[PDB]
Design a protein around this ligand. Structure first.
Ligand SMILES: [Co+2]
Ligand SMILES: [Co+2]
Lengths: 17, 414, 414, 14
């Protein structure tokens, strides 16, 4: 897909992502 | 990329695109785990969660039903130096999206009932990363590297800390940072002037920043953490010194990481996986903050080859540091970054998150041509130099394995 | 969306987009772990890895270097009934991308040196997926549901089978399945006829399909698999019968899953997470195959809460299977599906992927309006009647936890 | 439509 977010390498910290 | 500021201090950064129907709205706030203090560790993140637990106008469920009715393209996350709330909606619903996001930002009530149940989901969220050894080992590394500084504290916080977070602690924190100087609304895509007016008229309400955060600067400690966990693989993380967000040679660091373990053709990927087949996963990435930064390597291998894997990663980083990289490798990187950047321009969520993050952390923006030049300008001299400075330092180690003891191979390293 | 069938059977499906400057290329092969036999299990996935180990003119590393110089957006994945090789590049490199992807497809050199090597990487991949309880739990569910059927085989295979693998097995398999009737080339984005004809010319080399594959139909059974592992959370999966790909009532299932646990407003997210605070992660998804299909629910909670989670989920799946949908929910589901679908029209991979997958598993091409009609055409009782048929059955169960023993999920007492 | 199962574990590289 295209829609890109802005996470890191490894450490969950979202609603359900 | 039009950038404007309101009186309260909040900045509105926007970018109109012309071949898209959608629009990406993002509410950036310059605060995260770094800005917290021991006792409120986890507040930045727990707050991000409460913003979806209901307001006076709409309930947690009505909030879920609204975003779902518009693609379900909503989400939020928390980092060490910033928090983010965003959505991607077809323009004809962008106004409604902003109305819901506003209500959450301003009139979000932190009821005793919700704040209670939501504390649990984060307790589950915490255990979940805990059950994911290839994920939590990265955090265990941040801990070793920064000891007891806030850069070492987990985003999700600790369980003892969450256990006390009340509406008072939330609002106290929130009423300090969720102010003009930290807020930055970013919009990209089918941006209509009508939406920008709705944004200005809404985020003007945010109160000016009175509080003046004064923070300590971190220090790299070549420490090591080891957690015993019944696993199949031994998960290794090695951190090295990096560079600050807007440092002189950031792009040289990007290119360096690229040659290190940042891509298929990187030294690490080719040596550890491609030739030896020691790991399925081996990579590297740079983490840069406004005053510090680190270069991180990751690798998963069976419990036995942990000694073998270590010496191997050792050789590569050793050789890279000492001998540098070739011009072919440097040119292969520029093409990669340039091409990667190009393909990203097609995404709205991609341009929004870039602008918002830049404004919030660097305050400066560069057109595509300005970005491509910066990538070109980098010299093999620069990269190879940096490689020696950074990769010749004693690294920090975070390790998770069956026995929970450090490998013998984890010694010689100068 | 143009389609084209060459004389060997190969199909070229294209979709031009002027708004973009990129282009997604995909080589979709109609085979997967389902088409394998006891002894050759994992062969499909091994072949997919081996396709990147080197050709007669491009070595493993040269392949890597190429795709990196064009952004690095190339990936491969093996499913149960199809395999995929795709890449995203800028218009001015599509030709080269096709040449490289082509040469990998036809002229690969399965050198024992490189294959002995790759076998190890895949062995790590297996262990890594194993150290991810929230992921391997989904695989076990397929094993408990289908027993000895090929659908119950793990896509990565087993250490045993992999050790039996060699260039012989690979080519013997590649010869039967990587042929005319199974190959589909999907291209989306800023495509020029030149490139299309290049694709046409090149993929003519594909030998006509001569092997007649005989496939048996699967039987769904509510069996249980449990695994004792040291974890914080109890990872749980429940399986319910679903529908097979071709089925006319697929849009009905899509909407039914959306209501179940496929969104924020879904019953499970609200009942189990928002209200009870039991799970950080709870969701549902459906898997549709040639002859079979199935609805899946995942959930993870602290051990001490497992029995409560099963009951809570049970309650949710009952009032759904019994009473059905509401009119507000049915439309919310539609608004979402239409919304996300509309939003995906901006990604070339997204279209490329959709196109190639439907052409391969439906031998049909569905336009936007066509898919949209379907969504809207779904009546509220189609879903309800479906939820009653599917969600009543005794579910198959997968579970990973500390004591390793099944909880109290055999009786209906509370 | 799309056939995205659960957690990825069949891709090419990390
Ligand atoms: Co979170
Ligand atoms: Co794989």
């Amino acid at each position: 897909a295209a829609a890109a977010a802005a996470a890191a390498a490894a450490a969950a910290a979202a609603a359900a992502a | 990329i039009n950038t404007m500021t309101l009186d309260n201090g909040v900045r509105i950064i926007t970018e109109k695109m012309s071949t898209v129907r959608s629009v990406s709205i993002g509410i950036w706030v310059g605060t995260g785990s770094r800005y917290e203090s021991a006792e409120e560790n986890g507040i930045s993140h727990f707050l991000e969660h409460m913003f979806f637990k209901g307001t006076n106008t709409r309930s947690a469920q009505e909030i879920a039903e609204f975003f779902d009715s518009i693609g379900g393209q909503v989400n939020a996350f928390t980092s060490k130096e910033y928090t983010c709330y965003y959505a991607k909606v077809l323009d004809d619903h962008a106004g409604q999206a902003i109305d819901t996001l506003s209500d959450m930002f301003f009139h979000s009530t932190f009821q005793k009932e919700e704040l209670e149940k939501e504390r649990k989901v984060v307790f589950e969220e915490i255990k979940m990363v805990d059950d994911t050894p290839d994920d939590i080992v990265h955090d265990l590394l941040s801990s070793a590297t920064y000891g007891k500084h806030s850069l070492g504290y987990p985003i999700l916080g600790t369980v003892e800390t969450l256990n006390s977070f009340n509406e008072g602690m939330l609002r106290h924190y929130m009423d300090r940072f969720y102010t003009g100087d930290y807020v930055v609304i970013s919009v990209a895509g089918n941006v209509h002037d009508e939406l920008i007016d709705k944004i200005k008229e809404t985020f003007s309400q945010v109160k000016p920043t009175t509080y003046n955060y004064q923070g300590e600067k971190p220090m790299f400690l070549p420490n090591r953490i080891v957690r015993k966990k019944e696993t199949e693989q031994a998960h290794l993380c090695l951190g090295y010194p990096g560079l600050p967000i807007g440092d002189k040679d950031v792009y040289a660091l990007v290119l360096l990481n690229n040659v290190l373990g940042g891509s298929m053709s990187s030294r690490l990927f080719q040596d550890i996986r491609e030739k030896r087949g020691l790991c399925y996963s081996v990579f590297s990435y740079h983490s840069s903050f406004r005053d510090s930064g680190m270069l991180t390597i990751y690798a998963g291998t069976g419990h036995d080859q942990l000694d073998d894997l270590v010496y191997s990663i050792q050789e590569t980083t050793s050789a890279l540091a000492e001998k540098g990289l070739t011009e072919k490798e440097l040119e292969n990187g520029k093409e990669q970054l340039k091409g990667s950047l190009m393909l990203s321009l097609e995404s709205t969520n991609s341009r929004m998150s870039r602008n918002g993050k830049n404004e919030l952390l660097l305050k400066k923006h560069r057109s595509l041509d300005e970005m491509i030049e910066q990538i070109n300008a980098v010299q093999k001299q620069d990269v190879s130099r940096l490689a020696k400075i950074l990769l010749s330092a004693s690294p920090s180690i975070s390790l998770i394995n069956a026995n929970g003891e450090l490998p013998k191979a984890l010694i010689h390293l100068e």
